[PDB]
Design an enzyme around this catalytic site. Structure first.
Site, short mmCIF file in Angstrom:
data_model
loop_
_atom_site.label_atom_id
_atom_site.label_comp_id
_atom_site.label_asym_id
_atom_site.label_seq_id
_atom_site.Cartn_x
_atom_site.Cartn_y
_atom_site.Cartn_z
N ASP A 270 0.90 -1.13 0.00
CA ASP A 270 0.00 0.00 0.00
C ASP A 270 0.96 1.21 0.00
OD1 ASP A 270 -2.26 1.70 0.16
OD2 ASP A 270 -3.15 0.68 1.83
O1 LIG Z 1 -4.42 5.27 -4.20
C1 LIG Z 1 -3.35 4.42 -3.81
C2 LIG Z 1 -3.69 3.67 -2.51
O2 LIG Z 1 -3.69 4.67 -1.53
C3 LIG Z 1 -3.67 4.11 -0.20
O3 LIG Z 1 -3.49 5.21 0.65
C4 LIG Z 1 -4.97 3.37 0.13
O4 LIG Z 1 -4.80 2.62 1.34
C5 LIG Z 1 -5.24 2.37 -0.97
O5 LIG Z 1 -6.50 1.68 -0.88
C6 LIG Z 1 -5.05 3.07 -2.37
O6 LIG Z 1 -5.34 2.10 -3.35
#
Ligand SMILES: OC[C@H]1O[C@@H](O)[C@H](O)[C@@H](O)[C@@H]1O
Ligand SMILES: OC[C@H]1O[C@@H](O)[C@H](O)[C@@H](O)[C@@H]1O
Ligand SMILES: OC[C@H]1O[C@@H](O)[C@H](O)[C@@H](O)[C@@H]1O
Ligand SMILES: [Mg+2]
Ligand SMILES: [Mg+2]
Lengths: 720, 721
Positions: A270
């Site tokens: 993530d």
């Molecule tokens: O957008 C990129 C990623 O950002 C992260 O901060 C979130 O936890 C994710 O679900 C997301 O896909």
């Protein structure tokens, strides 16, 4: 292209090219980007990135358009040594440009096909705009509506979330083995592995802790179903899982994910979750973070630089085998292959696909499938097309109806509640109010609009920024001004319908008490106003059910239908006694339970004879005849639960195991049958075995977790 | 008598007597009781009990007095084949007849001696009334003030709870090998094993679930410290532990308790907890409940009849080995032996003399003054001059409900209310009493009149004790709303306000602190509450307690606790205001008041001597603290030492309390105390359940709360001592 040419590409790649293949970056850190080139210089400096890095980066995340992607890809390929094209990923969460209802609302559809069509339309539109992968489905079990990210889950039931999770993967990917050919389909990435939604006190990024048995029983199942259904990628979670940040958790990602779940695709961190293992205090610096994350099988670092700055030194010093890196690159190249980038790095690049009338109609049907009618006293709803409406509140004209996690959809294309209603109803007078205030001037205007009209449509809601990521609310209430407004409107002597827009369960008892009907729209997306109008007018008949419990008050949390009995259950025969499981100040039950939803229709269900006994390993076939005894066409969601009365572990009072939404004309009758396989009767024991014990089970057939008939079945004998 | 005869006694008992020995009953089910004999016939019949059962029952709980006991024991010995006396148990939780502060307040004492004196006095009075065992200490870690039973715990810190838990055991048992000699001492029974305070959503009896590592790291230590300190008994918990009711949890009770913790005493079921495994859905019937509970090593069934109606059939059919039964009986007889009951079945019994004495009452007062916590005191309103004219208003003005929950034997007629307490010390007091849950217009006129006359308001607010204790769960941790309105009203009257708060849990008190000048948290002080209150207000005692449980901003911040993990996106003072950090949109992350927080009328200055920069593995850190009272007023400070492990193979808490000492200091007076943080203090349970020490960086925090601290770094490494 064929596998040996891939395998060769790994062999031909320098160490540094391989490392950089394990990096993902925002579009404006690459040359060729059609947007934000003014952020590029400062950030390239801040991250200490070179052309060598960016020219060999594995992946882009969050391109703004087809022109951005084309631009970045055309430029990358100009100067990429081996012509390994870039894979482009995006957040397509509940729609691209045609925005569908938020996923929690989609949960309340209880409708697999609605979920698949959402995903397909999302993929059709996103592929049209140049993306290869969506960061979806979000499969985190949620029991805590303080957390903003509940909007992204389909709710508190593992089986529903597993089923809708598969529908989404099917929708996004179609046949995953043909992703190089079906260029209107795209790769799905399951998130967040694992258990992120159990964040303590609903606080974003907060500690998660449960026994491994509960992880397997309730938190893992949906991830696993989406994986088995073919999801191409998985994303790590921000939280600890038993003390260890998911991202560098070897047992979780090697033993469980890749071992037990047989997942052999890309694991992507993530956002900055690799560097962040340092904050969690399980790595001293980026070198350790990189080491531990690579040992754990994390293949693509999202927007941090532990790998690009440290992998070389770790490999050179012998602390890390270059085999791990090669395995990671291989998984990267295979995904590019599966997407057909080696033949068309622009994957068919289609504007004509984006925001069609057809798609908008589908998003609208999704909205009407997903809304939940919670109250409807004395048949206020549906309203006659000629009822004169006072439409009041912060959601009367707000354009903020598309929901959280809407990265690409535009509010200017959305339909607000005023516009939707004016289309249907001859007389509408509107008084709009602020989200967080109720002025005297407001009350005077509201009183004037209501005096003239026959019904109030009181449109209340959250702004979407009060939820989503890092949108935690300690108290799950609307701003107090909205409750006072509902209290005020109620004194005006006219019938009241509250159209509620939000991204989480809220404390709604004071809303239900101050109104004649309550309609929960969540955030329907682009067609919100029309979804709303159709339901209000009866053109559509509400058919959604709650996929998440609505608590009596913030302090009841967590409350959820599939709960343990405890050793001192409150029964109807002991209610009132002091020494039973209860609260002094509220009921044990939520204000509204899982599977609850009203209709303008009326149904009766009839379950056919069930056997009294069943062998271990044997399926239980459940046959249900349902009839619409009203004059109104409508849908009902038949639900089947099972309880294991006695077991080596204390088992939930009910678990959902099947469900089907049944469409019925007036007077009409249908029959559906469900198979509960022996897996439905199984559970994880204290030793982490998936097992089935001989014994008594109860089966519940009905239309919510509380509106059911109960049957008993004895399981024993031999095994099939 | 000799172990040898105890042994013999087991061979000499029939199967039926062996089974009955493992039964515990209320006094009024025995012949000879002198209260409630009119419940005997209906209930004996409902439980299907017979003379054979009751005449051989192992134990009594809840005898009403010395006479009850003597009557019952006399009758039982007359008809008992082998003359095996009854063992009599009771809930002596924070005092017998001299009621002391509730255990959560005692936790705020941060004072080991106060806790031991409490227990010793309790044991004096209870042995005097014929009781042999107390169902105390309660050692359940708590992070959830919705739960009524937080009143029974010493709070959210495992170390504090371990220390004080040891102090309690010592106080009750003294020299545990001499319980047959020291008849003013009594057996302690550690409860509730295990993790009962983690009940989901603070809902009574509700599901508990955590990883085994957390069980060991945070939930087990205090039970273990009390057991290692020699607690004679242990009681099972009502909750599941990892899916399995504690009472039939063989791993928990055989492997952990008897194995790893080496506990070889009597394991008693909580009330009906044996039958209730049936309600939890892990036993189909009393036959299975009895089997699984006996396999798990539960020796004494409290007030249900599974063992009694079923053990024989299980043993006869070969489903259960008689050796287990023999083992349980042996532990029951050993406890009776340790209590000297084979020589003296009346355990020294006329001792009325010893009950509710003046010396004991002063001890309870002292406990109360030790335990109260001063939360606010804007511009030195407190202490008040004895000539201060007081408007004493509110529901706690005259309420006699100041003894706290889990007070089974103490009588409110012996207690001192706030009015009486205050009239002893202050010449002018006008009193307007109001109700707990209402605020009438008439009340406001009357409060207005009393305040206009006087100089200061003592606004006494509080819970009824019945809103806490067992099955007193509150979803919302707030006083009745009328009380917040009364505070709000009183503030508008223009005169200075002190709120004396009486309660059994952390509550939302921000509106109370905002509407008053000073806030004094008294919890439920016990028999002398009025006097505890007056002495602290008047300044004869100087407040010195510290919070042993976090006071949340709002109900929905729960659970909030000082020893928390960092997360991957900690809110820092540099990233403040950013959206993507661990925070709430509507409240601060910090509790409204933190662990270790408490004010004083004195003022103190601390300096820590130089600490080594490096330490070997296995080696102790000696921490030397010089503390000076720099004010004119005599008082106590609680020095506190915490450790953090900055990097580890598990994400570790930002701080853990590892030592503390309350220091008394005359005006100007100075002292030095030293603490040893042994290598155990640097250790933790790893993902494989090994207790480990890892080389690396720690921080040491020395101060006067979890937040008021100086920080120092120490690098651990090299070789092992
Ligand atoms: O957008 C990129 C990623 O950002 C992260 O901060 C979130 O936890 C994710 O679900 C997301 O896909
Ligand atoms: O009692 C059930 C238990 O089984 C044991 O064998 C395991 O060590 C525990 O971790 C689990 O909670
Ligand atoms: O009084 C007997 C017992 O009652 C049970 O309900 C409580 O949980 C125990 O803590 C108490 O000792
Ligand atoms: Mg079973
Ligand atoms: Mg360390």
């Amino acid at each position: 292209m064929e596998q040996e040419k891939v395998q060769e590409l790994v062999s031909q790649m320098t160490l540094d090219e391989k490392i950089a293949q394990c990096l993902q970056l925002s579009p404006f850190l690459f040359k060729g980007t059609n947007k934000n080139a003014e952020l590029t210089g400062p950030l390239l400096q801040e991250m200490k990135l070179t052309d060598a890095h960016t020219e060999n980066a594995g992946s882009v995340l969050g391109s703004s358009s087809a022109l951005d992607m084309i631009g970045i890809q055309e430029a990358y390929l100009k100067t990429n040594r081996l012509g390994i094209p870039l894979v482009f990923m995006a957040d397509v969460i509940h729609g691209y440009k045609t925005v569908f209802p938020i996923p929690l609302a989609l949960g309340c559809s209880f409708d697999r096909e609605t979920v698949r069509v959402m995903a397909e339309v999302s993929a059709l539109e996103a592929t049209a705009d140049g993306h290869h992968v969506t960061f979806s489905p979000m499969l985190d079990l949620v029991r805590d509506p303080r957390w903003g990210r509940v909007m992204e889950s389909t709710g508190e039931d593992p089986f529903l979330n597993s089923e809708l999770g598969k529908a989404m993967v099917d929708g996004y990917q179609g046949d995953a083995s043909k992703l190089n050919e079906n260029l209107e389909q795209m790769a799905a990435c399951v998130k967040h592995f694992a258990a992120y939604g159990a964040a303590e006190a609903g606080l974003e990024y907060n500690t998660v802790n449960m026994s491994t048995r509960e992880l397997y029983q309730n938190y893992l199942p949906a991830y696993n179903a989406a994986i088995q259904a073919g999801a191409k990628l998985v994303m790590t979670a921000f939280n600890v899982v038993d003390g260890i940040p998911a991202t560098m958790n070897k047992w979780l990602n090697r033993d469980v994910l890749r071992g037990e779940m047989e997942f052999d695709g890309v694991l992507i961190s993530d956002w900055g979750a690799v560097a962040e293992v340092i904050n969690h205090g399980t790595a001293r610096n980026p070198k350790e973070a990189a080491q531990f994350s690579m040992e754990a099988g994390v293949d693509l670092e999202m927007m941090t630089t532990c790998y690009i700055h440290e992998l070389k030194g770790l490999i050179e010093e012998g602390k890390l085998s270059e085999n791990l890196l090669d395995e990671a690159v291989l998984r990267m190249l295979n995904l590019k292959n599966d997407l057909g980038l080696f033949e068309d790095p622009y994957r068919g690049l289609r504007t004509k696909d984006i925001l069609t009338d057809e798609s908008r109609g589908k998003a609208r049907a999704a909205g009407v499938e997903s809304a939940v009618l919670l109250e409807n006293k004395s048949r206020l709803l549906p309203l006659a097309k000629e009822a004169k409406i006072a439409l009041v509140g912060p959601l009367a004209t707000s354009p903020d109806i598309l929901g959280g996690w809407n990265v690409y959809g535009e509010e200017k294309d959305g339909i607000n509640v005023e516009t939707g209603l004016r289309e249907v109803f001859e007389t509408v007078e509107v008084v709009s109010t602020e989200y967080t205030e109720l002025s005297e001037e407001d009350k005077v205007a509201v009183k004037a609009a209501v005096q003239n009209m026959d019904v109030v449509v009181l449109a209340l809601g959250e702004k979407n920024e009060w939820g989503g990521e890092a949108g935690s609310l300690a108290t799950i209430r609307l701003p107090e001004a909205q409750y006072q407004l509902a209290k005020f409107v109620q004194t005006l002597g006219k019938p009241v319908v509250i159209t509620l827009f939000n991204g989480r369960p809220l404390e709604v008892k004071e809303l239900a008490e101050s109104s004649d009907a309550l309609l929960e729209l969540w955030f329907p997306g682009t067609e919100a106003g029309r979804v709303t109008a159709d339901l209000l007018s009866g053109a559509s008949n509400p058919s959604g059910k709650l996929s998440m419990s609505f608590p009596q008050t913030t302090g009841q949390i967590p409350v959820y239908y599939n709960h343990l009995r405890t050793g001192r259950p409150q029964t109807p025969e002991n209610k009132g006694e002091r020494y039973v499981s209860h609260y002094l100040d509220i009921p044990n039950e939520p204000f509204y339970p899982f599977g609850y939803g009203k209709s303008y229709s009326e149904f009766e269900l009839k379950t056919s004879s069930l056997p009294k006994e069943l062998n271990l390993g044997e399926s239980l076939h459940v046959e249900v005849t349902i009839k619409n005894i009203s004059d109104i066409a409508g849908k009902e969601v038949i639900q089947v639960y099972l309880q294991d009365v006695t077991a080596s572990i204390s088992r939930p009072v009910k678990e959902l195991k099947a469900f089907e939404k049944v469409a019925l004309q007036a007077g009409e009758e249908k029959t559906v049958t469900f198979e509960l396989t022996s897996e439905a009767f199984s559970f994880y024991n204290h030793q982490l075995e998936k097992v089935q014990e001989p014994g008594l089970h109860r089966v519940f057939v009905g239309t919510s977790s509380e509106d059911v008939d109960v049957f008993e079945v004895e399981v024993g004998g031999y095994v099939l």
